[PDB]
């Protein structure tokens, strides 16, 4: 996937790799294909969650996906552990 068009379906491999390294011991290394597979997982994660948020606001006849829909979607799809810290974060934007 070397075209700019293809690359635009993913987060940049450099931004992803930096994050991956944060979770690993300093001695750990990561093959190239692991960084690309992680790239596709992240875009899949973004589409998965958006798909549920989108469905909710469509049922509520709303045209804008916002932060509340996203966290509701993450609860619905099982990402409860992310939701607690994110709720406090998103509350900082509303108050």
């Amino acid at each position: 996937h070397m075209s700019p068009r293809e690359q635009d379906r993913f987060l940049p491999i450099a931004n992803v790799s930096r994050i991956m390294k944060k979770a690993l011991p300093a001695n750990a290394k990561i093959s190239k294909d692991a960084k690309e597979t992680m790239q596709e997982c992240v875009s899949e994660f973004i589409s998965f969650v958006t798909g549920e948020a989108s469905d909710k606001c469509q049922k509520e006849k709303r045209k804008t996906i916002n932060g509340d829909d996203l966290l509701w979607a993450m609860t619905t799809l099982g990402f409860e552990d992310y939701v607690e810290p994110l709720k406090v974060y998103l509350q900082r934007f509303r108050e």
Binding site: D8, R9, F10, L11, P12, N15, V16, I19, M20, K22, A23, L24, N27, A28, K29, I30, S31, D33, A34, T37, M38, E40, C41, V42, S43, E44, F45, I46, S47, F48, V49, T50, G51, S54, Q58, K63, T64, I65, N66, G67, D69, L70, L71, M74, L77, G78, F79, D81, Y82, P85, L86, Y89, L90, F93
Partner: protein, 80 residues
């Protein structure tokens, strides 16, 4: 934390169903994406430790996906 908010919106709006996106939604998504990378990387790493190796490889992610139910949605693209 510095995932590009513009790239995230592009990925969200690749879905034709999506119309408008709130101002804070991509920011929040950036944070969630980070936690997702951390947890998936770390889970994969433990399969690397158990195989006694030191390189995180693609198969280590394939194994991780199969062990955790929250990652079950990924088996369509990273088959074991």
């Amino acid at each position: 934390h510095s995932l590009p908010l513009a790239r995230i919106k592009k990925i969200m709006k690749a879905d034709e169903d999506v119309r408008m996106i709130s101002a804070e939604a991509p920011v929040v998504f950036a944070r969630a994406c980070e936690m997702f990378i951390l947890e998936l990387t770390l889970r994969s790493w433990n399969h690397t430790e158990e195989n006694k190796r030191r390189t995180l490889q693609k198969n280590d992610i394939a194994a991780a996906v199969t062990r955790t139910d929250i990652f079950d949605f990924l088996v369509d693209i990273v088959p074991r």
